[PDB]
Amino acid sequence: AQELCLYLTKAASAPYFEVVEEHEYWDQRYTIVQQQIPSFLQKMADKILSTGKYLNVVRECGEIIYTLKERAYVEQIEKAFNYASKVLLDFLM
Amino acid sequence: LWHDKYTLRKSMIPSFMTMDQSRKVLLIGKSINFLHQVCHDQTENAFQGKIDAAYFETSKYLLDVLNKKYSLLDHMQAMRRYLL
Protein backbone atom coordinates (compact mmCIF):
# COMPACT_ATOMS: atom_id res chain seq x y z
CA ALA A 1 0.00 0.00 0.00
CA GLN A 2 3.08 2.23 -0.31
CA GLU A 3 3.45 1.49 -4.01
CA LEU A 4 -0.23 2.42 -4.40
CA CYS A 5 -0.27 5.71 -2.48
CA LEU A 6 2.77 6.63 -4.56
CA TYR A 7 0.88 5.92 -7.79
CA LEU A 8 -1.93 8.26 -6.76
CA THR A 9 0.21 11.20 -5.63
CA LYS A 10 2.33 10.81 -8.75
CA ALA A 11 -0.83 11.35 -10.82
CA ALA A 12 -2.76 13.71 -8.53
CA SER A 13 0.11 16.20 -8.72
CA ALA A 14 0.66 16.65 -12.46
CA PRO A 15 -1.89 19.51 -12.62
CA TYR A 16 -0.31 21.32 -9.67
CA PHE A 17 3.21 20.91 -11.03
CA GLU A 18 2.05 22.32 -14.37
CA VAL A 19 1.00 25.68 -12.94
CA VAL A 20 0.28 30.44 -4.53
CA GLU A 21 -2.87 32.30 -5.55
CA GLU A 22 -3.16 35.32 -7.81
CA HIS A 23 -5.28 38.47 -7.65
CA GLU A 24 -6.33 41.36 -9.86
CA TYR A 25 0.51 47.16 -6.83
CA TRP A 26 2.73 44.10 -7.26
CA ASP A 27 2.95 42.63 -3.76
CA GLN A 28 -0.80 41.97 -3.92
CA ARG A 29 -0.64 40.21 -7.29
CA TYR A 30 0.59 36.82 -6.01
CA THR A 31 0.52 36.01 -2.30
CA ILE A 32 1.35 32.85 -0.36
CA VAL A 33 -1.52 31.00 1.30
CA GLN A 34 -0.20 29.73 4.60
CA GLN A 35 -2.46 26.72 5.19
CA GLN A 36 -1.85 24.88 1.91
CA ILE A 37 1.90 24.37 2.37
CA PRO A 38 3.20 20.78 2.07
CA SER A 39 5.26 21.18 5.30
CA PHE A 40 8.15 19.53 3.50
CA LEU A 41 8.53 22.46 1.10
CA GLN A 42 8.08 24.88 4.03
CA LYS A 43 11.83 25.50 3.81
CA MET A 44 11.43 27.00 0.32
CA ALA A 45 8.02 28.65 0.61
CA ASP A 46 9.56 31.98 -0.46
CA LYS A 47 11.72 30.90 -3.40
CA ILE A 48 8.76 29.29 -5.18
CA LEU A 49 6.63 32.43 -4.92
CA SER A 50 9.64 34.48 -5.98
CA THR A 51 10.44 32.20 -8.93
CA GLY A 52 7.20 32.51 -10.87
CA LYS A 53 6.70 36.16 -9.94
CA TYR A 54 9.79 37.11 -11.94
CA LEU A 55 8.53 35.10 -14.91
CA ASN A 56 5.36 37.17 -15.20
CA VAL A 57 6.82 40.70 -15.21
CA VAL A 58 8.64 39.58 -18.36
CA ARG A 59 5.98 37.41 -20.02
CA GLU A 60 3.42 40.21 -20.14
CA CYS A 61 6.12 42.50 -21.56
CA GLY A 62 7.41 40.24 -24.34
CA GLU A 63 10.24 17.11 -14.01
CA ILE A 64 9.80 16.64 -10.24
CA ILE A 65 9.23 13.43 -8.26
CA TYR A 66 8.78 12.95 -4.52
CA THR A 67 11.38 10.95 -2.58
CA LEU A 68 11.97 10.36 1.12
CA LYS A 69 15.26 11.37 2.78
CA GLU A 70 16.44 12.48 -0.68
CA ARG A 71 16.21 16.14 -1.66
CA ALA A 72 16.37 15.76 -5.45
CA TYR A 73 13.34 18.06 -5.75
CA VAL A 74 14.52 20.67 -3.24
CA GLU A 75 17.66 20.95 -5.34
CA GLN A 76 15.63 20.95 -8.56
CA ILE A 77 13.76 24.11 -7.54
CA GLU A 78 16.93 26.08 -6.80
CA LYS A 79 18.22 25.24 -10.28
CA ALA A 80 15.27 27.10 -11.82
CA PHE A 81 15.00 30.03 -9.40
CA ASN A 82 18.69 30.68 -10.06
CA TYR A 83 17.70 31.13 -13.72
CA ALA A 84 14.38 32.89 -13.12
CA SER A 85 16.24 35.96 -11.85
CA LYS A 86 19.06 35.91 -14.40
CA VAL A 87 16.51 36.48 -17.17
CA LEU A 88 14.72 39.36 -15.43
CA LEU A 89 17.70 41.09 -13.81
CA ASP A 90 19.45 41.05 -17.18
CA PHE A 91 16.19 42.27 -18.71
CA LEU A 92 16.46 45.50 -16.70
CA MET A 93 20.17 46.21 -17.13
CA LEU B 1 22.58 19.94 15.71
CA TRP B 2 25.49 17.99 17.27
CA HIS B 3 25.12 18.21 21.04
CA ASP B 4 21.40 17.28 21.10
CA LYS B 5 18.63 15.53 19.00
CA TYR B 6 20.65 12.22 18.94
CA THR B 7 20.60 9.70 21.84
CA LEU B 8 22.22 6.21 21.95
CA ARG B 9 19.39 4.04 23.31
CA LYS B 10 21.09 1.63 25.70
CA SER B 11 18.02 -0.63 25.75
CA MET B 12 17.36 -1.39 22.08
CA ILE B 13 20.89 -2.34 20.98
CA PRO B 14 20.97 -5.86 19.53
CA SER B 15 23.31 -8.28 21.26
CA PHE B 16 25.13 -9.04 18.00
CA MET B 17 26.50 -5.48 17.80
CA THR B 18 29.25 -4.51 20.22
CA MET B 19 28.77 -1.32 22.22
CA ASP B 20 31.53 0.40 20.25
CA GLN B 21 29.99 -0.42 16.87
CA SER B 22 26.81 1.29 18.04
CA ARG B 23 28.70 4.59 18.37
CA LYS B 24 29.98 4.46 14.80
CA VAL B 25 26.48 4.32 13.32
CA LEU B 26 25.16 7.16 15.56
CA LEU B 27 28.15 9.09 14.22
CA ILE B 28 27.66 8.23 10.54
CA GLY B 29 23.96 9.04 10.72
CA LYS B 30 24.64 12.35 12.51
CA SER B 31 27.41 13.17 9.99
CA ILE B 32 24.98 12.91 7.06
CA ASN B 33 21.92 14.45 8.76
CA PHE B 34 24.06 17.47 9.71
CA LEU B 35 25.63 17.61 6.25
CA HIS B 36 22.19 18.25 4.71
CA GLN B 37 20.41 20.71 6.99
CA VAL B 38 23.04 23.03 8.46
CA CYS B 39 25.88 22.68 5.97
CA HIS B 40 23.28 23.11 3.18
CA ASP B 41 24.51 20.41 0.82
CA GLN B 42 22.99 17.36 -0.85
CA THR B 43 24.57 14.35 -2.54
CA GLU B 44 30.01 -11.14 10.44
CA ASN B 45 33.18 -9.61 9.01
CA ALA B 46 31.86 -8.00 5.83
CA PHE B 47 29.40 -6.17 8.09
CA GLN B 48 32.20 -4.60 10.14
CA GLY B 49 33.89 -3.58 6.90
CA LYS B 50 30.72 -1.83 5.79
CA ILE B 51 30.58 0.42 8.86
CA ASP B 52 34.21 1.46 8.43
CA ALA B 53 33.72 1.99 4.70
CA ALA B 54 30.81 4.30 5.48
CA TYR B 55 33.00 6.05 8.06
CA PHE B 56 36.28 6.71 6.24
CA GLU B 57 34.30 8.27 3.38
CA THR B 58 31.52 10.33 4.96
CA SER B 59 33.69 11.99 7.59
CA LYS B 60 36.54 12.64 5.15
CA TYR B 61 33.96 14.38 2.95
CA LEU B 62 32.51 16.39 5.85
CA LEU B 63 35.85 18.15 6.36
CA ASP B 64 36.23 18.95 2.66
CA VAL B 65 32.88 20.72 2.53
CA LEU B 66 33.75 22.38 5.85
CA ASN B 67 37.15 23.66 4.68
CA LYS B 68 36.33 24.76 1.11
CA LYS B 69 32.81 26.14 1.56
CA TYR B 70 33.43 27.63 5.01
CA SER B 71 37.22 27.57 5.63
CA LEU B 72 37.02 26.28 9.19
CA LEU B 73 40.81 26.25 9.45
CA ASP B 74 41.31 29.76 8.05
CA HIS B 75 39.24 31.07 10.96
CA MET B 76 41.23 29.28 13.67
CA GLN B 77 44.41 30.98 12.45
CA ALA B 78 42.65 34.31 12.02
CA MET B 79 41.06 33.99 15.48
CA ARG B 80 44.57 33.77 16.97
CA ARG B 81 46.03 36.77 15.15
CA TYR B 82 43.35 39.19 16.39
CA LEU B 83 41.48 37.74 19.36
CA LEU B 84 44.71 36.40 20.92
**Following DSSP, what letter does each residue of B15-79 receive, concatenated?**
TTS-TTTHHHHHHHHHHHHHHHHTTT-----HHHHHHHHHHHHHHHHHHHHHHHSS-HHHHHHHH
Return phi, psi of residue A21, to 5°: -115, 150
Nearest chain A Cα distance for residue B42, angstroms: 7
Angstrom distances, CA of residue B75 to CA of B1, B49, B65, B67: 21, 35, 15, 10
CB of B42 less than 8 A from some CB of A: yes
Q: Chain B residue closest to A43 (CA)?
A: B37
The pairing of strands A21-22 and A30-31 is: antiparallel
Angstrom distance (rounded) from CA A1 to CA A9: 13
Task: Tell me which method was used to determine the 3D structure.
Answer: cryo-EM
CB of B32 less than 8 A from some CB of A: no
**Following DSSP, what letter does each residue of A18-81 receive, concatenated?**
G--EE----TTTEE--SSS--SSSGGGHHHHHHHHHHHHHHHTT------SS--TTHHHHHHHH
Set of chain A residues whose Cβ sits within 8 Å of the Cβ of B36: 71
Angstrom distance (rounded) from CA A50 to CA A28: 13
Resolution in angstroms, to 1 decimal, for this deposition? 8.5
- Sign, CA dihedral A44-A65-B57-B50, equals positive
CB of B37 less than 8 A from some CB of A: no
Put simply, the chain B residues between 6 and 25 with a CB less than 8 A from any chain A CB are none
CB of A71 less than 8 A from some CB of B: yes
Angstrom distances, CA of residue B58 to CA of B20, B25, B27, B63, B64: 18, 11, 10, 9, 10
Angstrom distance (rounded) from CA B72 to CA B84: 17
Q: Chain A residue closest to B42 (CA)?
A: A71
